Amino acid sequence: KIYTKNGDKGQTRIIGKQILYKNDPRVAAYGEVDELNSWVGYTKSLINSHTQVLSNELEEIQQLLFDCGHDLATPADDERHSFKFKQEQPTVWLEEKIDNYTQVVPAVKKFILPGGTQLASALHVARTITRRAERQIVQLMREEQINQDVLIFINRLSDYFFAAARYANYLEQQPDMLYRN
Amino acid sequence: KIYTKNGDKGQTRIIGKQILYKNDPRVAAYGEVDELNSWVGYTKSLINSHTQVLSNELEEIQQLLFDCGHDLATPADDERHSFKFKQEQPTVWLEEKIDNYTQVVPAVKKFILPGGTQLASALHVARTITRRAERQIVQLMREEQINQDVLIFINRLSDYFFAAARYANYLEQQPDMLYRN
Amino acid sequence: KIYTKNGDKGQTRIIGKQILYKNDPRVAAYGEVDELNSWVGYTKSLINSHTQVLSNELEEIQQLLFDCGHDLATPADDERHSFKFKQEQPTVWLEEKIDNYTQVVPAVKKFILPGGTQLASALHVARTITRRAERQIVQLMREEQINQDVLIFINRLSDYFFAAARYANYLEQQPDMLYRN
Numbered sequence: 081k082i083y084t085k086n087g088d089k090g091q092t093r094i095i096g097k098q099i100l101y102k103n104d105p106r107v108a109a110y111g112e113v114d115e116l117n118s119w120v121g122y123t124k125s126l127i128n129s130h131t132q133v134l135s136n137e138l139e140e141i142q143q144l145l146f147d148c149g150h151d152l153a154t155p156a157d158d159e160r161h162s163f164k165f166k167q168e169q170p171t172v173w174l175e176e177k178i179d180n181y182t183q184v185v186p187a188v189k190k191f192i193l194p195g196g197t198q199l200a201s202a203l204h205v206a207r208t209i210t211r212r213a214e215r216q217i218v219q220l221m222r223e224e225q226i227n228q229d230v231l232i233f234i235n236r237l238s239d240y241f242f243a244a245a246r247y248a249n250y251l252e253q254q255p256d257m258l259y260r261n
Numbered sequence: 262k263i264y265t266k267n268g269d270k271g272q273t274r275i276i277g278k279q280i281l282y283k284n285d286p287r288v289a290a291y292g293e294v295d296e297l298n299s300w301v302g303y304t305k306s307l308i309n310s311h312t313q314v315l316s317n318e319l320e321e322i323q324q325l326l327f328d329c330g331h332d333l334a335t336p337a338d339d340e341r342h343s344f345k346f347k348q349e350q351p352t353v354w355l356e357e358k359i360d361n362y363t364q365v366v367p368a369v370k371k372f373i374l375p376g377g378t379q380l381a382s383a384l385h386v387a388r389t390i391t392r393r394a395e396r397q398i399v400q401l402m403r404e405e406q407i408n409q410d411v412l413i414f415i416n417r418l419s420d421y422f423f424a425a426a427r428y429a430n431y432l433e434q435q436p437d438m439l440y441r442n
Numbered sequence: 443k444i445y446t447k448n449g450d451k452g453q454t455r456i457i458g459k460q461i462l463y464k465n466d467p468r469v470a471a472y473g474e475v476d477e478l479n480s481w482v483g484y485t486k487s488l489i490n491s492h493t494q495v496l497s498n499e500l501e502e503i504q505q506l507l508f509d510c511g512h513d514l515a516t517p518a519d520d521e522r523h524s525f526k527f528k529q530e531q532p533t534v535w536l537e538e539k540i541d542n543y544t545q546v547v548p549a550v551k552k553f554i555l556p557g558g559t560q561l562a563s564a565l566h567v568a569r570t571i572t573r574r575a576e577r578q579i580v581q582l583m584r585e586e587q588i589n590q591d592v593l594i595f596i597n598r599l600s601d602y603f604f605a606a607a608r609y610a611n612y613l614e615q616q617p618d619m620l621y622r623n
């Protein structure tokens with residue numbers, strides 16, 4: 081059975097033997113990353129012929145977020161369990177994409193508001209959910225030692241979603257939504 | 262008029278006469294369940310011919326979540342108002358569905374990542390929003406006496422969404438997304 | 443480049459020179475409004491021929507939310523920077539719409555559950571995300587002086603989404619979902 085009922089009184093296991101309340105900042109950080117992952121899965125379900133080029137990298141992002149969640153669930157001083165996530169190559173990978181997408185899209189002009197195509201709009205939602213997860217990761221960091229690589233990546237990731245959102249609009253010839261002064 | 266403006270200074274009524282700030286953990290718990298309910302409504306709007314079998318139980322879940330919200334809004338020591346939600350039959354009902362859906366879907370293999378069809382992806386989002394509500398319910402529980410039946414149900418409910426998500430993928434012959442080691 | 447990396451250690455700038463941790467209630471309030479804005483962009487991407495009448499006002503709401511976010515990011519005692527958002531005309535504008543939509547839709551009957559058409563369901567999600575942002579705005583208010591006009595507007599805005607959701611259902615001849623006693 082997938083249900084143990086062990087969590088019925090509001091406590092849960094993390095990586096290692098530690099049992100925490102589900103409102104613990106560590107469990108919250110893990111959960112926000114999990115919710116982001118689910119949103120990314122939802123976003124990739126909206127891909128069409130015009131935007132198929134985005135499918136692979138979204139899948140890779142889900143893989144990377146699973147690793148982020150693992151590390152958030154891992155106490156830094158746990159002898160038996162260690163961090164698995166390293167920021168350097170995934171973050172440089174994001175930066176390459178941010179750079180590429182930023183140059184191909186039209187120069188603006190005004191501040192950009194979230195929206196456009198359904199996919200671009202979803203990528204904008206991904207941006208804001210990433211930022212929500214980031215806040216909770218910072219909450220955890222202020223109480224416990226974390227894998228700081230996760231925070232670097234999650235910071236960069238919301239810029240990725242912004243750039244990818246603009247690019248998704250561009251791919252369907254949809255103008256970005258702009259703030260009118 | 263649906264607006265009283267009574268809430269314009271950030272306070273609000275619960276069940277009974279009590280007035281709380283909108284950031285009170287009780288109001289937050291109620292609100293997270295309400296947001297879950299809205300997400301379930303959104304999810305059921307995505308049902309197609311292949312997945313029509315899921316419509317009725319999602320509607321029943323919305324009914325049950327309304328009852329959960331009521332009880333979260335009810336102080337335990339309120340003489341005039343009492344809990345209405347009982348976990349036993351709804352939770353056994355969920356468990357029956359979890360069991361059925363778990364056996365019909367393919368055995369894996371790897372850890373499952375959220376995604377697949379738009380409906381399955383939405384059900385995965387429902388899973389994570391349920392867990393977010395659960396954390397806030399636990400926050401409330403740590404400060405105030407709650408209807409513990411609500412927590413049992415909400416715990417089980419996220420397993421329901423996981424199982425139903427896999428089942429929704431299965432119903433459209435879509436493989437579950439898997440974590441690559 | 444859109445990424446400075448200045449935020450990689452979990453701190454960020456607001457309006458003016460102040461640097462805050464990303465989990466600061468002010469940054470959280472700003473972020474929740476931003477997430478609402480993205481959800482509104484997503485919602486407006488779902489508009490069809492039957493509901494095109496809702497497009498313009500949703501766009502105006504995104505403009506207004508950008509102004510709300512600005513003011514939430516502005517300390518009240520900052521000499522160099524001031525509040526830009528005034529509630530009176532936008533809120534009266536919402537109230538006019540709430541009144542109109544409330545009278546055209548069928549009288550009920552039972553408590554309304556969120557759902558119906560995909561757009562109506564999305565507008566119901568907008569309602570709950572607005573309320574989530576409202577809670578965080580109240581959290582900030584309890585620690586710092588805020589532009590209280592933002593809170594008035596955000597309070598009213600969730601009633602707008604409720605009314606607009608019902609109206610969106612009505613526009614496609616879809617009955618509201620009702621709670622069965």
Ligand SMILES: Nc1ncnc2c1ncn2[C@@H]1O[C@H](COP(=O)(O)OP(=O)(O)OP(=O)(O)O)[C@@H](O)[C@H]1O
Pocket residue numbers: 082083084085086087088091092093094095102107108110111112153391392393395396416417420
């Ligand atoms: N509400 C939640 N939010 C975020 N993370 C959670 C939540 N509940 C559990 N977790 C984390 O996700 C993992 C898997 O969740 P699961 O629901 O199986 O655990 P549980 O609730 O403790 O057990 P059960 O549901 O079987 O009673 C947990 O081991 C814990 O690390």
Ligand SMILES: Nc1ncnc2c1ncn2[C@@H]1O[C@H](COP(=O)(O)OP(=O)(O)OP(=O)(O)O)[C@@H](O)[C@H]1O
Pocket residue numbers: 263264265266267268269272273274275276283288289291292293334572573574576577597598601
């Ligand atoms: N932001 C919120 N988040 C979660 N729950 C809320 C929120 N605001 C109100 N509630 C709860 O939902 C109920 C209905 O909300 P409603 O918006 O009508 O109340 P209000 O804001 O106090 O009044 P008004 O909007 O008429 O000024 C409230 O009585 C309260 O229990």
Ligand SMILES: Nc1ncnc2c1ncn2[C@@H]1O[C@H](COP(=O)(O)OP(=O)(O)OP(=O)(O)O)[C@@H](O)[C@H]1O
Pocket residue numbers: 210211212214215235236239444445446447448449450453454455456457464469470472473474515
């Ligand atoms: N996680 C977050 N949640 C909500 N608001 C944020 C978050 N991060 C930054 N902000 C706010 O949004 C603005 C723009 O975000 P941005 O990501 O560019 O800032 P940063 O993270 O400090 O810098 P960088 O991403 O370049 O390292 C910030 O100046 C701050 O006001």
Ligand SMILES: [Mg+2]
Pocket residue numbers: 235236238449
């Ligand atoms: Mg940043």
Ligand SMILES: [Mg+2]
Pocket residue numbers: 087416417419
């Ligand atoms: Mg559980």
Ligand SMILES: [Mg+2]
Pocket residue numbers: 268597598600
């Ligand atoms: Mg209100």
